[PDB]
């Protein structure tokens, strides 16, 4: 029923995440990168996470959220190639 | 499997449509009251009735 044995986190296997979409090349508005699911907001390049900063770039495409609270889950403001 | 349990598998019946639809129904009332409007591969908005 409950949970016992004063223990912390619960484990299993190896993570199933990747680094798809380095971004500096074309990219249709879709989930750039993969780690955890369910998240929206970013509609372009919005790599911004606590640290030395983050980035992405060039690619004119309406929308394009991130994975979730990970590699810059925050939603910055627009960005395209330079001249789409 | 089959017997005396909640879930029960029964197919719909749009009427003239080619049937097909999977929807179970536990014993907790209501009983005789399939579901409602469905759109089988055929004419738009056709009758329903998962009961059989």
């Amino acid at each position: 029923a409950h949970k016992k044995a004063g223990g912390s986190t619960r484990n299993g296997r190896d993570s199933e995440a990747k680094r798809l979409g380095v971004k500096r090349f074309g990219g249709e508005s879709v989930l750039a990168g993969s780690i955890i699911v369910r998240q929206r907001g970013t509609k372009f390049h919005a790599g911004a996470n606590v640290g030395c900063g983050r980035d992405h770039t060039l690619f004119a495409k309406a929308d394009g959220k991130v994975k979730f609270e990970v590699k810059g889950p925050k939603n910055r403001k627009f960005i395209s190639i330079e001249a789409e | 499997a089959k017997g005396i349990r909640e879930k029960i598998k029964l197919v719909s019946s749009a009427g003239t449509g080619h049937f097909y639809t999977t929807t179970k129904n536990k014993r907790t009332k209501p009983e005789k009251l399939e579901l409602k409007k469905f759109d089988p591969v055929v004419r738009q908005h056709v009758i329903y009735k998962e009961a059989k």
Binding site: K43, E69, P73, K74, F78 | -
Partner: protein, 113 residues
């Protein structure tokens, strides 16, 4: 990210910011009704008109009714079209339906917005 104080009060709208346009705020006081065409990045007011200013034209009755709310909408919008704005979204933070805010919006469209 966490929900900002403004998001907790849902008075703001991030979905209208993803487009990159302007708003049409409708403030209401038990005495006067205000309307503005503010643009993102702070409180940038392009055009605005108060029901009290409607008296400058020739308003006689009270300024806290529905017919006055529609009069202000036509004024704020008329000045907006003179500014150079065409489209705008309705932003009525906290209010009911069919109220004075709807009369303000219906008035804005009547002008050309």
């Amino acid at each position: 990210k966490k929900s900002a104080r403004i998001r907790r009060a849902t008075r703001a709208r991030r979905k209208l910011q993803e487009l990159g346009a302007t708003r049409l705020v409708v403030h209401r006081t038990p005495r006067h009704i205000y309307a503005q065409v503010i643009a993102p990045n702070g409180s940038e007011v392009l055009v605005a008109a108060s029901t009290v200013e409607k008296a400058i034209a020739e308003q006689l009755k009270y300024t806290g009714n529905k017919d006055a709310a529609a009069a202000v909408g036509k004024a704020v919008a008329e000045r907006a079209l003179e500014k150079g704005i065409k489209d705008v979204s309705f932003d009525r933070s906290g209010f009911q339906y069919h109220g004075r805010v709807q009369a303000l919006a219906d008035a804005a469209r009547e002008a050309g917005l």
